[PDB]
């Protein structure tokens, strides 16, 4: 996810690391003011405070501080102390948000003309980074460079020739700094340029937090502050530390520490849906947290996550007690037994405080070993006396929310996969490959879908597998070149590389034209690298599914890695033979919920794809919707959209232009995001809305107006899918 940084942090980074021949005035002339400031030290460390006039403002992610009257301008140091006395430690309201003014930044006042102020902004898109100046707009493409002469010719057309060389030089330095330190947004408004040089009067910025492993040295102990209106809490940092030390995903944001509605949901998608449901039932004001765990965390990691929740919800008593919602989709991959054993351990260690605080627990879960998981979850309820109501896959995912709240407890290729698909798997993933072979067998495939594996940290060798009951060998290669030249029949590669090596291994794969489809599994790739992956993929005509995805499945033909889980899920959801329903979602866990939902209301899934949660997926919703339009076996299309970006609108335009004619059912998750006083970023790195059009509510209305079938909520998604299906059956379009 991209995260905002304070103005001081951004100016800190800029003063230290901008590489420019321009003169940047007042570098390191700032002073941070908190209620705990030692004002004697402050004057000692920043003596310029006493010898020139100053500017004071809060540094707490509040924009338009001028229009809000939150900027003392051209004051002496004594005037600053006085300007601060009514304001420091006092509440303030910016739009919907209310919070304490507690962090201020003092800087020298810069006498300047109105004409010496300039606007500069750099922000990232899929196609590269745009540079704004004034409004002049220039696109720097992926893997391109910003020629200072390109700045002079497009940005500085209406600029005086004398100021033209310091502006181009500063912007060139600012852009390289922007790129080197993995910024995604950098705004200076105003940038003051006088005869003495360049002044950075204001700075707002966001950096790609996933690039920590690349930028550690220069970022230092970088601080990502909460949005104005909310506070930061030590438990969030603790969980974020668990997230860094694990390939699994672990996230937690506190919304209301005193609220009585607590969630511990698996999956970035599912956790947004439970929050949406809670919001629809009036519980937003009592919603204590948003968070998720996914990517198959261990028993121990899940215990550490769960115990943070249980401690946070036993800090004080609520007269009506409290409720804990332990939900999730039917997981593809996460071990339900292993993770619920960890939650059970936490519940056990906190059973005293939980009974003391009158906590009622509601559980809904499916996935690998979910029967054991639900059993041990009911066992701990009986031995502790804690009321725990447990439900399985038979129960609608969000049903436990209503139970808990209804009262207070008393164009690229059309076809990617076929029965004949042969794939290379990058990484050591015996369990994933075996899960694919089991699926291939019950699908009545002639041959295994995995022809070879590649892992450059071991030598060439064979690997035993089970094909049905018989045992077989699949070659494992150290060098990708060897696997490719010996298996020209392979056209799919499923990349299980970690986030650190996924970039290079995927770029290497695209040197082999025989590979037409690449699934990138890893979550946490920096967005700027994925853009380079997208650029090369587009140049080579290679379809990329991912990153940050479990993959997808084509019943009867092929399934990417862990998608679809164990045989018992393959059989229950009828994923061993195709139906007429195709779907695409961002969430991998929710995609398996759709497998189950579609299995129960139609003839079954024809093909399903999870494009991943990252901001720039290798393939988009529209890309796969188009494939389904052009696939005759597909008769209806289901899209599980999400807040953030404008991708779903391309579906609207496609209908309006006659390109898309088959029935489309779509629901966009994230409707509760607009109910909050502050912004909240969900589990998926791309689930962030800037404009009103990027909200799930706005997209749902737009989709519905264009002829898409949109349910009222996620709860009715299964209803409207069954209803569209039966029409097609009645009209003869589908014959089971
Ligand atoms: Na992680």
From Swiss-Prot:
Keyword Nucleotide-binding attached: yes
Domain ATP-grasp: 3-251
Activity regulation, per record: Phosphorylation results in activation of its activity. Glucose 6-phosphate, fructose 6-phosphate, fructose 2,6-bisphosphate, ribulose 5-phosphate, and fructose 1,6-bisphosphate also act as activators.
Outcome reported for the amino acid change (mutating residue 464 to R/Q): Decreased acetylation and increased de novo lipid synthesis. Abolished ubiquitination by the BCR(KLHL25)complex
Sequence positions that bind CoA: 703-713
Glycyl lysine isopeptide (Lys-Gly) (interchain with G-Cter in ubiquitin) crosslink site(s): 464, 470, 478
Modified residues (N6-acetyllysine): 464, 470, 478
Residue positions binding Mg(2+): 243, 246, 248
BP terms from Gene Ontology: acetyl-CoA biosynthetic process; cholesterol biosynthetic process; citrate metabolic process; coenzyme A metabolic process; fatty acid biosynthetic process; lipid biosynthetic process; negative regulation of ferroptosis; oxaloacetate metabolic process
Catalytic function, reaction form: oxaloacetate + acetyl-CoA + ADP + phosphate = citrate + ATP + CoA
Residues at which ATP binds: 57, 65-66, 108, 110, 117, 202
Binding site residues for citrate: 295, 332, 334, 350, 365
Compartments reported by the entry: Cytoplasm, Cytosol
Keyword Zinc applies: no
Cofactor(s) needed for function: Mg(2+)
Superkingdom of origin organism: Eukaryota
This protein's GO CC annotations: azurophil granule lumen; ciliary basal body; cytosol; extracellular exosome; extracellular region; ficolin-1-rich granule lumen; membrane; nucleoplasm
Modification type Phosphothreonine: residues: 563
Result for mutant: residue 470 to R/Q: Decreased acetylation and increased de novo lipid synthesis. Abolished ubiquitination by the BCR(KLHL25) complex
Protein family according to the UniProt entry: In the N-terminal section; belongs to the succinate/malate CoA ligase beta subunit family. In the C-terminal section; belongs to the succinate/malate CoA ligase alpha subunit family.
Quaternary structure and interacting proteins, as annotated: Homotetramer.
Function: Catalyzes the cleavage of citrate into oxaloacetate and acetyl-CoA, the latter serving as common substrate in multiple biochemical reactions in protein, carbohydrate and lipid metabolism.
Protein name (record): ATP-citrate synthase
Taxonomic source organism: Homo sapiens (Human)
Encoding gene, per UniProt annotation: ACLY
């Amino acid at each position: 996810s991209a995260k905002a940084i304070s103005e001081q942090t951004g100016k800190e980074l800029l003063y230290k690391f901008i590489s420019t021949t321009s003169a940047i005035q007042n570098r390191f002339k700032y002073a941070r003011v908190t209620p705990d400031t030692d004002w004697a030290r402050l004057l000692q460390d920043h003596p310029w405070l006493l010898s020139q006039n100053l500017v004071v403002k809060p540094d707490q992610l509040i924009k338009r501080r001028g229009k809000l009257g939150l900027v003392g301008v051209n004051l002496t140091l004594d005037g600053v102390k006085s300007w601060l006395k009514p304001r420091l430690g006092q509440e303030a309201t910016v739009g919907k948000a209310t919070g304490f003014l507690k962090n201020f930044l003092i800087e020298p006042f810069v006498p300047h003309s109105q004409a010496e102020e300039f606007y500069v902004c750099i922000y990232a898109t899929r196609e590269g980074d745009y540079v704004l100046f004034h409004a002049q707009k220039l696109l720097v493409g992926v893997d391109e460079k910003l020629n200072p002469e390109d700045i002079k010719k497009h940005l500085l057309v209406h600029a005086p020739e004398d100021k033209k060389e310091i502006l181009a030089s500063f912007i060139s330095g600012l852009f390289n700094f922007y790129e080197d330190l993995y910024f995604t947004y950098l705004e200076i408004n105003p940038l003051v340029v006088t005869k003495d040089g360049v002044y950075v009067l204001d700075l707002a910025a966001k950096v790609d937090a996933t690039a920590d492993y690349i930028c550690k040295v220069k970022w230092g102990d970088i601080e990502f502050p909460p949005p104005f209106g909310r506070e930061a809490y030590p438990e969030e940092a603790y969980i974020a530390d668990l997230d860094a030390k694990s390939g699994a995903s672990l996230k937690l944001t506190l919304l209301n520490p005193k609220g009585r509605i607590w969630t511990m949901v698996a999956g970035g998608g599912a956790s947004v849906v439970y929050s949406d449901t809670i919001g629809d039932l009036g519980g937003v004001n009592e919603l204590a947290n948003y968070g998720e765990y996914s990517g198959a965390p261990s028993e121990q990691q899940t215990y550490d996550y769960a115990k943070t929740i249980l401690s946070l919800m036993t800090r004080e008593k609520h007269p009506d007690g409290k409720i804990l919602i332990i939900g999730g989709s039917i997981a593809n991959f996460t071990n339900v037994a292993a993770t619920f054993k960890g939650i059970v351990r936490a519940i056990r260690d906190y059973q005293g405080p939980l009974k003391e605080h009158e906590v009622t627990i509601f559980v809904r879960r499916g996935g690998p070993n979910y029967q054991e998981g639900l059993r041990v979850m009911g066992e701990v309820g009986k031995t502790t006396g804690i009321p725990i109501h447990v439900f399985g896959t038979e129960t609608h995912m969000t049903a436990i929310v209503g139970m808990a709240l209804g009262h207070r407890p008393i164009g690229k290729s059309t076809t990617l996969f076929s029965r004949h698909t042969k794939a290379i798997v990058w990484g050591m993933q015996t369990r994933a490959v075996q899960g694919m072979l089991d699926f291939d067998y019950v699908c009545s495939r002639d041959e295994p879908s995995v022809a070879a594996m590649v892992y450059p940290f071991t030598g060439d060798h064979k690997q035993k597998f089970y094909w049905g009951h018989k045992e077989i060998l699949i070659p494992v290669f150290k060098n990708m070149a060897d696997a490719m030249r010996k298996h020209p029949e392979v056209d799919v590669l499923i990349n299980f590389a970690s986030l650190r090596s996924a970039y290079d291994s995927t770029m290497e794969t695209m040197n082999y034209a025989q590979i037409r489809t690449i699934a990138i599994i890893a979550e946490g790739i920096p967005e700027a690298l994925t853009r380079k992956l997208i650029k090369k993929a587009d140049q080579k005509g290679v379809t990329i599914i991912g990153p940050a995805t479990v993959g997808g499945i084509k019943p009867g033909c092929f399934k990417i890695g862990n998608t679809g889980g164990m045989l018992d899920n393959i059989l229950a959801s009828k994923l061993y033979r195709p139906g007429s329903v195709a779907y695409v979602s961002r969430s991998g866990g929710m995609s398996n919920e759709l497998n189950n939902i579609i299995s129960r209301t139609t003839d079954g899934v024809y093909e399903g794809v999870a494009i991943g949660g990252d901001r720039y997926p290798g393939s988009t919703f529209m890309d796969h919707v188009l494939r389904y339009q052009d696939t005759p076996g597909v008769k209806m299309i289901v899209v599980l959209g999400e807040i953030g970006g404008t991708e779903e609108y391309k579906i609207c335009r496609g209908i309006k232009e006659g390109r898309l004619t088959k029935p489309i059912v779509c629901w966009c998750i994230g409707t509760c995001a607009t109910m909050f006083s502050s912004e909240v970023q969900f589990g998926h790195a791309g689930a962030c809305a800037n404009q009103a059009s990027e909200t799930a509510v706005a997209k749902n209305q737009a989709l519905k107006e264009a002829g898409v079938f949109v349910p009222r909520s996620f709860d009715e998604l299964g209803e409207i899918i069954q209803s569209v299906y039966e029409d097609l059956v009645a009209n003869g379009v589908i014959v089971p």
